[PDB]
Symmetry: D2
Subunit: 481 residues, 4 copies
């Protein structure tokens, strides 16, 4: 039949097995063509027009590359073609659950629209995968190419979301444990999904990538660590791994957490919230769902993409006026205004349940400056951003196993001081951005005074531009000089 | 003010004048974010997710680069800042008139939906530009930055569409004639729009570009040719100019005229035709327009983007069933089947008014093979493609002026035989692709027999796979050996 | 053992089998570090610092890629690991015979220094390979890794130089015929050596490469053609193959035949000729050789690299004064002056044995202008350059075999008219460059008059700048208008 | 006059002022074609064939870019074309002083050959520049283009080496202080030399660069800081500046301090030391100089390049046997063996004058294992490497001035806690590599035991492979856990 060839600008010419083609040529997978990888990021980086679809192809490709390379170097692992196909399918399908504008949907909209429910793209991907399989008669195709659907569907879902409940997985046994480290690596965060987005996002954003995934593959091996088979890196590659996470952090600082990209995501979310009572999406049995409830029905969710943005923008319904107007403001670039950024000092850390009280706190600050306008809580947005190396406070290199040239089957551990004094001492921090919904010059001036006063009151760090934006407030603080 | 800086993956960090920002931050310009540069090509090249918006920024940037470079080298041209801004604005806005899926709209849909009307993206761009200016109070902003709206609006439109009726232009006089060669060069086709799409399309398609626009700029000069000031290239760069057009032709062969991309464009066009009576788009004064009539009202046209595809795909109306079903077949990748490709021999050239007669001709061919299914005219699609070097049958290098190192103010001509014997003897040709709407094995086999027989009957070239797909037909033709 | 891994900027991370490492770590191979790929080109393109060593690694790598790919797709070919190693070794070693400044040595110096002898880099490579094997005890290492030295040494040499004299090869039989098409393809010129230098030269020159060798590999198959197994390309890739040779021609026009790079090569050759009686190189048994006789003894030739240039430049011997002075003039950029370029028309073609008569012919021309300086034959240099598609007058695509999607084991042929009307009508031409050794403005003016007059007298093409450089000469010629 | 245009693979098409061309076309500048940028690095990274010449062109080009950009944005700085040319010349000429194999010469050879003298490439560059000017009649050419030689030669030398003896410079006054921050920035290390080598080294090494110099230029301004005009960065670019130094550190870890590249540099240095009594280089007045004394005479130093390596390698003099043999071992890849790497803990820091005592210390360690070979001090090499952010222990961002968007003429300071907790806590460290000159298996095993024992005895960090290479030694140390 067909090994189809696909030309990808990041990976070049990729071969797709006919079973992968069958999965790809479905409304559930093709849907990813209409969901932007970086959401609101496109509105700041005009190169970032790329969608989840092409990222998914790349993830499936790299998953295949890594499992093949391991199998060629270590025939004793007994990786079968069936294993390779299952890993490729998981790599291909791990983005199926994303919603309009990607992280905006799961990171901002759903938590506000449906605070009671716990929703992740991972869960969505498993549900959509099930829907894809059942709606398109995939199971007989899997059997035709040597898969065993019961075991292998389970294995694929487990790769995506983790244990579907002592060895906790049912899709494959402990001697194939390393296969769970490829698509979504919950142990240390080194997975093929990161490798594709590093390369792809960089190519589109116009920022250059310093991580070499092909080198890592060449140096990768499977070793026994604590009775378990794990993918291990060559010892001397440790520096490269530190750099990989540094790259990830840089991408988040420069692009994914860009202050204006975040505010555009915030405005789109607001628009969706105001549209939520009036947009109807037809799901299974002709039932109607909302933007916020399409996650409950996969048939409906299949039709929930970036197009919602344009449905609202182009609407004529008076009911959608408020939602439509917010999107129109985005088009005119009448954005909420960035006021500034600060961080907590020392051990002190800000709990999630306090986020809603923060705009009130800013509005309550009493700056000794003459102000013609005074602002209220609702005029402020406070966006708290948790930046880490993927494992909260932990160093993921403490969770990585290495091997040495002289004994390639012997796994070892490497600690931070065995590497460099010039590495991060901490692996998590919080950034606090403040914005003002009132966009006029007088309001922005006032907002800067409240903000810097609030920072001083909370003993947060001095904003970078603090002496310029609030010259009358910054002298009060001793610690700021 | 101060400039905005925009990071573009092709051009890096670009400066935008505040007037350009004002023009960009409008619904008329932001619309271009929702129109794919390569239309159906995305469905073949997954990297080609890029939209007309980012291309437009690039064109505006390069227009500025060229006019600046000329002014720095030749102060005697008297290029003013006003001229630079007008050239940038034209470059920025020359894509405003594109419709859903770009060339699909003006190349396929409108000629079928509205055969009586003459429509071009150029005309559309002028109409949209006027609408953009008038709807957003741009004229006072132009005066603020030293533009004279009456003259300069005229100049910008003329750059986009050409003479609005010897010297035929009103926006600038003959001593600034060279300025009309930058954004859309009607004399020879060497303009900045090509330079951006060569680099941008290549970056996204995953194909590399051989043309160096920065070299060309470095060697560009303005000289008097026939009492007119024109942009001239250095003599020895002639090979590079031939190569530029070769690059353009290669991009068309490999990507823009890809056989499956074209059939996807064809299917989308069919879907739009079937949807045309039922999709309603609200224009000026609340009036309703169709997909095919939105070009008559710019307010309506502003809201006509790629989104139409998703509106149809997600529709529930039984009236839209036929349109919706076509798009669903695209998603399942049930595409019309490629039968093959042929070309005319010699003097024979196929007129546009004969395109409709061609499917009938294929169905009329009488292959001497026993056939279980016979096919009708409507089961065939015949797609005729005109490939040239941008000036129909002419060599555009015959319309280029050069200068020599020893006399940089003296314009000269170079003929083909002064360059190389290894160049094309002709500069235009036609490709004929045939597809079959019936997708089953028996029908496809039959379609191949009719096709090859038709080629033989018309003394078209032997299809490349002719001996394999029609082993019983190919021996009859003497000419094919 | 395990592989060494080498990071190459063109190909990334390359694995080298330990036998290849043994071959590489020898004075005969390491020698290639001291020989510039593009010779005098470095003096025009400052990026072109790259040497034959890294090019050789790339060729060996790509040879391995192609043979592996073929073997994986078609197990029935019976490609063994022994075959893969032999192909890699041939790819690695096919550059061993190059001399100082690469093509300058075999293309310019040796034919002038030793007109009686017939010498090629290919012959040199075979001799050096033999010397490498024998001097470094490689044969037992070959046996250790499963090679059979007698048969396999023969096979490797045959890949490099062709038949060492009905099936003409002894290293492998007709059922492995396709293996001879990989490293140096005598049938059509599509080999891995071209693919490495396209990518590498482009990377260093600062000119971008439009040929995708990875796509070619993906579409390559072995089919029976006229009782012989040959590498065949997919039908629809024919355009890409035409483009590959177009790319080669463009690299020669822009870079390898750069007019000043050629004149620098010419000057270096002159310097070597003047140094040849006095530089001594110690060879086998302590015998002394000349630059021109080092090719007779491999031990001596091992020590003959670009260093010769610096030995001359840094010399103090009065005997080397004339040679040294030429090189000093190169450093001051006192080069021979470019006068112009022309080509023959029609039947006329210029034979190698006429090259020496050409400067006399230019000096003999009688331009009707009063001239204050007159020049002699020795003041002129005439450089004749043969540009073709690698097979003299032939179209190498007439020597390529293809397959179609519907019958992948069935080889077919494709003619020029089955492809495009926009292709070259001829596949060979000659370029004639004229230079003047007298650099002053009066002499250069005179040289231009003689040159254009000579062109007219011989009915050569009109020089591009002819109307500017010789305004009194060009009107006499009818055919120039 | 008109510019020469040069095509550079990093920067594309560069314009060179005719005075720059005059400087470039001299034996003193052309010499840099024969000195490899990365020295022994080429023997590890085969892409790193690049020489100091092309790097110098790039530095001159970027120096020009930065000074032009500042002048265009801030006309009030009064930057003249004279200033631009002087900055370009300094940028062009700041690499003139490098010796064979670049850092090997000043970093390893001269300190061992001539411990009494203090020599730097900077000092060498000033001396060579003076020699270049005087030997080639450059001063009249400078006057012709509007330079004032006395003042401007002084200015150029000051940019290269710093104050030639309160404002300490004589070439320009305090109101042009910012001009001293461009070519070699002693205040904070942000200069154009780094920018060129980041891009160029990465391009050739096959490692990707994450620093965007064009972005920095776009955001750069000159502001008053402490009565002095200095180049300032936009506040929010601070992360990018931290990253610039991170990039520099990564290039040193991965490439410039590569353990095998360093040992090759060490072996070449040993060969030069053994050759030093016998190589003669003819300098001014026919006087003879040694490799170690050519730095005393510029005429001699002009002829001291990488060629020395080949002169030794190809020599027949019995006196050069020992030097020649070392180079031959490099060719066979019989290198000294890497034993391992460690670092000091805490306060402990190792002074340069202690380096000689270190091999003795390793040999003195008493590992409690029966060993069949014992090794002596001369069998060990200990290489101590100082890694910092360019300012020893200091954070160079503490020496950078920033501006904010709302007050672009007001300079501010940013402290480390105002940026991120995820940054380095220390900015300097030492790496200690140990190698063994005895290459046999028994000796290497013994060397590993001495090494790890020494680490334990000195409370240095545990070697990464310590548990594998010295399983009997590592358990004794408490702190290694
Ligand atoms: N000449 C080319 N260079 C680079 N990419 C190309 C070229 N031609 C096509 N592609 C891209 C488009 C697709 O992403 C991928 C496969 O295209 P192509 O090989 O034409 O497949 P196809 O499915 O249309 O052909 P068939 O089914 O006839 O093999 O390569
Ligand atoms: N660190 C970075 N590297 C590359 N591109 C970046 C980086 N940071 C932002 N960009 C991109 C996004 C935009 O396309 C362009 C400008 O962004 P940026 O300088 O952040 O503008 P801004 O409008 O957010 O800043 P302000 O208005 O504060 O000057 O640069
Ligand atoms: N961090 C890196 N990134 C990219 N290339 C590198 C890196 N470090 C080294 N290289 C290059 C240098 C060589 O071209 C190739 C192999 O280097 P490296 O793996 O360090 O080999 P090695 O021979 O020194 O290690 P060992 O023998 O200890 O495995 O990759
Ligand atoms: N077609 C090309 N594409 C890219 N770079 C080129 C090309 N031709 C030449 N170069 C490079 C080589 C040099 O680095 C730089 C200048 O080359 P070129 O323009 O041919 O200078 P030149 O000095 O020979 O011409 P002249 O003196 O006749 O103007 O550009
Ligand atoms: Mg995106
Ligand atoms: Mg597109
Ligand atoms: Na693509
Ligand atoms: Na180098």
């Amino acid at each position: 039949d067909t090994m189809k060839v696909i030309n990808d600008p990041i990976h070049g010419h990729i071969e797709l097995h006919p079973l992968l083609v069958r999965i790809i040529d479905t409304p559930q997978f093709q849907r990813l063509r209409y969901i932007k990888q970086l959401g609101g990021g496109y509105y700041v980086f005009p190169g970032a027009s790329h969608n989840r679809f092409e990222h998914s192809l790349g993830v499936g490709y790299l998953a295949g590359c890594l499992v093949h390379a391991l199998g060629e170097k270590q025939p004793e692992l007994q990786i079968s073609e069936r294993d390779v196909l299952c890993v490729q399918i998981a790599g291909l399908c791990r983005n199926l659950g994303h919603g309009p504008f990607s992280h905006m949907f799961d990171g901002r909209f759903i938590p506000l629209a449906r605070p009671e429910v716990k929703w992740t793209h991972e869960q969505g991907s498993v549900m959509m995968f099930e829907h894809l399989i059942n709606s398109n008669g995939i199971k007989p195709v899997m059997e035709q190419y040597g898969l065993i659907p019961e075991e292998d569907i389970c294995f694929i879902k487990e790769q995506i979301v983790g244990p579907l409940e002592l060895w906790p997985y049912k899709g494959r046994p402990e001697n194939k444990s390393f296969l769970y480290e490829i698509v979504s690596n919950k142990r240390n965060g080194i997975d093929v999904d990161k490798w594709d987005y590093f390369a792809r996002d960089c190519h589109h954003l116009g920022i250059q990538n310093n991580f070499d995934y092909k080198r890592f593959i060449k140096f990768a091996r499977v070793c026994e660590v604590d009775n378990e088979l794990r993918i291990c890196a060559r010892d001397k590659e440790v520096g490269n791994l530190y750099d990989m996470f540094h790259t990830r952090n840089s991408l988040h600082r420069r692009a994914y957490q860009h202050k204006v990209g975040n505010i555009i995501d915030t405005m789109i979310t607001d628009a969706f919230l105001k549209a939520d009572d009036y947009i109807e999406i037809t799901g299974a049995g002709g039932k109607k769902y909302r933007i916020s409830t399409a996650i409950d029905d996969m048939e409906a969710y299949t039709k929930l993409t970036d197009n919602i943005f344009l449905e609202i923008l182009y609407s004529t319904d008076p009911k959608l006026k408020d939602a439509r107007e917010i999107l129109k403001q985005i088009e005119y670039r009448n954005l909420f205004k960035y006021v500034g950024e600060t961080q907590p000092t020392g051990q002190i850390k800000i709990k999630r349940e306090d986020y809603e009280s923060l705009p009130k706190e800013v509005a309550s600050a009493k700056p000794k400056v003459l102000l013609d306008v005074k602002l209220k809580a609702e005029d402020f947005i406070v966006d708290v951003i948790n930046m880490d190396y993927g494992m909260q406070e932990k160093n993921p290199i403490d969770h990585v196993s290495f091997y040495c040239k002289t004994a390639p089957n012997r796994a070892i551990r490497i600690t931070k001081n065995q590497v460099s004094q010039l590495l991060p001492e901490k692996f998590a921090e919080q950034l606090i951005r403040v914005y003002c919904k009132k966009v006029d010059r007088k309001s922005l001036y006032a907002a800067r005074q409240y903000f810097v006063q609030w920072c001083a009151d909370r003993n947060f760090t001095k904003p970078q531009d603090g002496d310029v934006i609030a010259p009358l407030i910054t002298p009060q603080k001793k610690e700021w000089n």
